[PDB]
Amino acid sequence: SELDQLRQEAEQLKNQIRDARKACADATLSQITNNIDPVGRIQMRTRRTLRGHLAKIYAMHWGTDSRLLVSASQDGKLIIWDSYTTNKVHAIPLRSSWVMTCAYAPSGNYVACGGLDNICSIYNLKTREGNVRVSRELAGHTGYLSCCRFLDDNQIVTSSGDTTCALWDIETGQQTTTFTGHTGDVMSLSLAPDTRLFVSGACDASAKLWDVREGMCRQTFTGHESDINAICFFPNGNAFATGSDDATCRLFDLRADQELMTYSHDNIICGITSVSFSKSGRLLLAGYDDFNCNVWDALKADRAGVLAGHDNRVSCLGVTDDGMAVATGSWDSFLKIWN
Amino acid sequence: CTLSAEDKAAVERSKMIDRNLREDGEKAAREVKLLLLGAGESGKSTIVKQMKITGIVETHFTFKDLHFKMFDVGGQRSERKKWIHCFEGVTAIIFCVALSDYDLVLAEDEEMNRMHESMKLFDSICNNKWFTDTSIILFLNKKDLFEEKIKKSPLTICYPEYAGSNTYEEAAAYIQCQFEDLNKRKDTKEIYTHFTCATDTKNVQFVFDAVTDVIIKNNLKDCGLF
């Protein structure tokens, strides 16, 4: 019928897209990089650890000046940490006892936090009254919250739960632009350093990038077996790395859009939770569900020394903006601060 | 010993905040919570409404000097493989299936009866490996339809194998048997399989008895004899 001919067109178009993808490739990336020697064998000892919570910890993010740290707890508590002095700034009670994502505004004024309550709550930090007070209740979408990040003081981008992603405004609660191209629930999103593009990853073994101002599809990538549970960007806006629940790593580039090195290991069977890069784009710190923090090389596939000091499974990991510290949080009440 | 005025003020405030949060956790320790997986939009509104007297909705009461809270996760319309693991500290899960829901086309596939997908859902949540120490309570709610529905419509249509005669007791026991036989790990959990009613307010007392039983066996297997 008419549907069958449309499907034939779609599959044929995919055919020449794959033909172009195969034609663009010339040689494997690791083929040329073999000339350089490895950095070596690296490890770090625990530097300081904190004892502040009573249950599982899901969300934890750095500040804007690489000095302030905030984390989200299973109980309706929100805590503000200090790096060197290991003191604490504030402990903000929450309304919705269930949360899964916390964000920190770069201007040092706002903190975002949301959960399964299908709402987004924004609190002001410094006020002339003297206590932290909630500002408004930005909500409206039909799905649960998966990730929430900040662009600047007066726009915010939230990762939906059903199939969508949108850009919002703070002064007005109305949503400006809505994106509907995915085929399932979405997991997390990451913003580019230029603050003009962002890649978000759904659960249908695909991921794509978007336009902040224009607002429709540019490119689509596939080539995984199951959902992607982690996304991160290169320090320079040229490539990005994708994870998977099958414990395999995967790196994507933009213009060449070609197949790159697959950071896979034979003895690893169990999956991953979160991933982020460090400065210079040389090391790929990764979090696993086997109580392990494997370290790989950006330009070589060689295995390197690992960090393992948490009894119970780890969830998130992140590095500072100056390369002076890295912190990982696990499902136990403990939170660790490395070098 | 090098701390200045601001430093010791900060550490004193840190200690105060720590003691407040510790006391808050102590306050929030000793309350039981339950999960209400409806598995059908028929009786959940009922079962929540007689207990009282957007997204997740919370209902709270006090009964015989013991606090309760209920969480509803019925209408979310999303895949459960990603958010179910967030519920690990729940003591027990209340499961409900309507009685007269059989002999219906489900209005979607018009081939499978509601018993089918209800059994698959119950089996899937029973063999969820995150749940090992959790207990299950079954509540058959809309009983008043069954006695007159059975004589016009027997259970033979809904089952390939035989179901005996047509009397209330045997049918109740037989429904009970396919409800019971779904389990595989009988060594750790237990079932209560009540037949509730629309009056007499004995359901609250039954819930009290079931929850105290779970507490008792939990502590016993935790320490000493068990």
Partner: single-chain antibody, 234 residues
């Protein structure tokens, strides 16, 4: 708002007593801390005492070490302060203040209205030798301030506060640290301090810029105050 009032006053012969109370008005009295300062008729200021949050650490002055008493009550949002016996050098006004301490904290924001009381008829010293300058409006003139001891500390911060007091009103927080300027002030001013000898510079002399300025330090436990530098409008 943060409106604050003080109760108590009058005249009493030496050896008498009077009760001093202040009532908080909805500004998070739970987390903040109180203070008290001395102000002789036309002279400088002098620190009285301290109160911490949670009835913990408490500090007393030297001149009133065995003399003054103070207490705080969390409910009713009020502060308590008692006189036992009055000497001939206790005739001064009060100006209680508030402050909180954390990372980005700005101490000494609000200022009260004060109250007079008439009876009958080590420290890093601040000099502020400058007294009066004939500055005319429309230009930039600065005032210097240097100490007796080097306030720099290995943490990486300085401790000096600046204030401005219009005649007949309460002061206001100008800058709490060098290159750090408190809210409620335009961008005409700057820090301009280094070493152990600091100054403060203004861009243009505006009409409401006439008054007096004072120098603070927050290094040693007992705080003392600077001199008075009156600015004349001519």
């Amino acid at each position: 708002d943060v409106q604050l009032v003080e109760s108590g006053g009058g005249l009493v012969q030496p050896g008498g007593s009077r009760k001093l109370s202040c009532s908080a008005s909805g500004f998070a009295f739970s987390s903040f801390g109180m203070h008290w300062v001395r102000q002789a008729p036309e002279k400088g200021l002098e620190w009285v005492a301290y109160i911490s949050s949670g009835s913990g650490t408490i500090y007393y002055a030297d001149t009133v070490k065995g003399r003054f008493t103070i207490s705080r009550d969390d409910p009713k949002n009020t502060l308590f302060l008692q006189m036992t016996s009055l000497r001939s050098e206790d005739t001064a006004m009060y100006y209680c203040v508030r402050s909180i301490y954390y990372y980005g904290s700005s101490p000494f924001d609000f200022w009260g209205q004060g109250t007079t009381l008439t009876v009958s008829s080590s420290d890093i010293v601040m000099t502020q030798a400058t007294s009066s300058v004939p500055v005319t409006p429309g230009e930039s003139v600065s005032i210097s301030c240097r100490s007796s001891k080097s306030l720099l500390h290995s943490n990486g911060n300085t401790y000096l506060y600046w204030f401005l007091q219009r005649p007949g009103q309460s002061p206001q927080l100008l800058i709490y640290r060098m290159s750090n300027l408190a809210s409620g002030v335009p961008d005409r001013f700057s820090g301009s301090g280094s070493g152990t000898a600091f100054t403060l510079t203004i861009s243009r002399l505006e009409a409401e810029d006439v008054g007096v300025y004072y120098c603070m330090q927050h290094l040693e436990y007992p705080l003392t105050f600077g001199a008075g530098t009156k600015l004349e409008l001519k």
